[PDB]
């Protein structure tokens, strides 16, 4: 439940006898954790809010000019000085102008002309800072079992529902227990500070559109820049790159503004994440969190019930998710109170020997009135199989055909692994990380190689690194020395970055 259709979910199975499982949560997909004898719990990150950001260095992307003025001097007399040059609100440029006997001053050298123009800014974009403290993550988890198909994305007063829980996680309280009534409580220790880089990301606003911008792109930008506190009549310490002092001929000088600049910033931003704002807080919808799951206080509600023997009707019928699982929504006719639904994948209906794996929870209908609804999902075997629901001589059976042999599943698993590593960097080694010694060695050497690779390359974008990938591919292909492998290795890294976006 809550993860049936997300199309980017991965199953985390097994643990050290039920002690704990490492899990990385991402915004795109969700993780369904299944234990040996415990209810399957689906966990998903929802939104990451940032709070009380502190404004820093707001820029100007649209200038406005005002009453120009100018002053000139004799070929020998010195340099021009307008009385408006002693004001920090005027742009002033000094140049040389042809003069003599025609304009009014007798001598024929070049003169000196100063022009000044007042600067007014309509619109400005501001950049705000984000400390990795006071950063709140909101995790939503739900459980399989007894909820009918309707309650998959239904967001309501989930405090009462008893099957779905919501957890806030902040650097001031990284540990939390989600109390699932009657199922126990899922303990969840999580690391919020190391989530996503939040010491290099400014929150940038232009006009009701907010981005996450990398610092060192919000400092090497050439526009009139204030600094921090907006108090009264602002002052911009630039007076250049937004006013163009175009010269005429025969001592004519003109001042123009460049227009509105909000088109170069929208295209200068490419590959910077989007965000949205609510009140004083900023909701980012793209992030990365790593929570260790201490699921040793989860129980099974269904056990010790007696199994229902009335009838079962397949109403919505069986359906196939993107990963192979099979969701079934059954309706129970009998009035047998709380009860245990018998369901098993089976082939060779002569002797129903359970095959496949039942990734549900403790199956069980909790309603007691007349007709109840339930939804359970099964992981079927690759060949043809029969979904069997019911006890005896009134068993409803459905025919199911799953496509791809185990080799296909292994290849798709390795593709998922490559994508996850390319996206998450070193941390990807912690996905199903019960944690041994081999996994830790892998994490270490991948961390070293990652630091080196990010220090050499990683100042390049899609096209540029496709280029350097092909070039290093050739160079390694015909170098004839022993370093060829090294160069060829580089290609993989670089080229794989391109074919996973």
């Amino acid at each position, epitope marked *: 439940i809550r993860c049936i259709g997300v199309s980017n979910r991965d199953f985390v199975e097994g643990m050290s006898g039920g002690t704990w499982v490492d899990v990385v949560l991402e915004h795109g997909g969700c993780v369904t954790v299944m234990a040996q004898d415990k209810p399957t719990v689906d966990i998903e990150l929802v939104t990451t809010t940032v709070s009380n950001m502190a404004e820093v260095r707001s820029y100007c992307y649209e200038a406005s000019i005002s009453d120009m003025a100018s002053d000139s001097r004799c070929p020998t007399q010195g340099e021009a000085y307008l009385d408006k040059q002693s004001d920090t609100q005027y742009v002033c440029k000094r140049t040389l102008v042809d003069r003599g006997w025609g304009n009014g001053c007798g001598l024929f050298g070049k003169g000196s002309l100063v022009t000044c123009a007042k600067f007014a800014c309509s619109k400005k974009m501001t950049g705000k800072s984000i400390q990795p403290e006071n950063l709140e993550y909101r995790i939503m988890l739900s459980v399989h079992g007894s909820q009918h198909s*309707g309650m998959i*994305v*239904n*967001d*309501t007063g989930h405090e009462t529902d008893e099957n779905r829980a919501k957890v806030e996680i902040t650097p001031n309280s990284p540990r939390a227990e989600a109390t699932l009534g009657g199922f126990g409580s899922l303990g969840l220790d999580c690391e919020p500070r190391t989530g996503l880089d939040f010491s290099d990301l400014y929150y940038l606003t232009m006009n009701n559109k907010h981005w996450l911008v990398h610092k060192e792109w919000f400092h090497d930008i050439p526009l009139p820049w204030h600094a921090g506190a907006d108090t009264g009549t602002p002052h911009w310490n630039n007076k250049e790159a937004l006013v163009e002092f175009k010269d005429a001929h025969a001592k004519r000088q003109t001042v123009v503004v460049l227009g509105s600049q909000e088109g170069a910033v929208h295209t200068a931003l490419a590959g910077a994440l989007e965000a949205e704002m609510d009140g004083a807080k900023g909701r980012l919808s793209s992030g990365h969190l790593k929570c260790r799951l201490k699921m040793d206080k989860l129980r099974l509600k269904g056990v010790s019930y007696s199994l229902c023997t009335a009838a079962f009707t397949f109403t919505k019928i069986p359906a196939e998710t993107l990963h192979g699982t099979v969701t079934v929504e059954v309706q129970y006719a009998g009035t047998d109170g709380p009860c245990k639904v018998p369901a098993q994948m089976a082939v060779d209906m002569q002797t129903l020997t359970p095959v496949g794996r039942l990734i549900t929870a403790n199956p069980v209908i909790t309603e007691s009135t007349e007709n109840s609804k339930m939804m359970l999902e099964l992981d079927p075997p690759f060949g043809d199989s029969y979904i069997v629901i019911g006890v005896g001589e009134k068993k409803i059976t459905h025919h199911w055909h799953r496509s791809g042999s185990t080799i296909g599943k292994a290849f798709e698993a390795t593709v998922r692994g490559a994508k996850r590593m390319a996206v998450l960097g070193d941390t990807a080694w912690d996905f199903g990380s019960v944690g041994g010694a081999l996994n830790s060695l892998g994490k270490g050497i991948h961390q070293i190689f990652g630091a080196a690779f990010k220090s050499l390359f990683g100042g390049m974008s899609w096209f540029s690194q496709i280029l350097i990938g092909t070039l290093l591919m050739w160079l390694g292909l015909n170098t004839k020395n022993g370093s060829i492998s090294l160069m060829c290795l580089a290609l993989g890294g670089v080229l794989i970055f391109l074919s996973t976006a």
Partner: nanobody
Amino acid sequence: EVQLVESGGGLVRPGGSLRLSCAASGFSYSNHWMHWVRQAPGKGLVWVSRINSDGSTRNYADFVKGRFTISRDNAENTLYLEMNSLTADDTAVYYCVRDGVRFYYDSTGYYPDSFFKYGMDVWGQGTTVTVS
């Protein structure tokens, strides 16, 4: 029991504009489709407009050639219908309606599937507007 309350109706000269509002309480407003329907005095019900949960999908009947604009504020549980270039044909009582049947299947109320099962279960008392 959810109560829908219409507001803003009044007499207007031909060609005028008016902003009708609707207050909802007692249900998850942010997750339901909303409708405006109208009824001329002594005439039948005439469907006017509908809006989804976020406002990304606005549907209007053919009679309103872009004159009317439907919108909503989920945090305020409010629905708005701004009407421009009103004529005598616009004199009617307008009911603000909640689509409760759609909420049964699509709890997000966002995806505007074609020919989806619907039902306008909860009606307001309606506000009378006369373009005279």
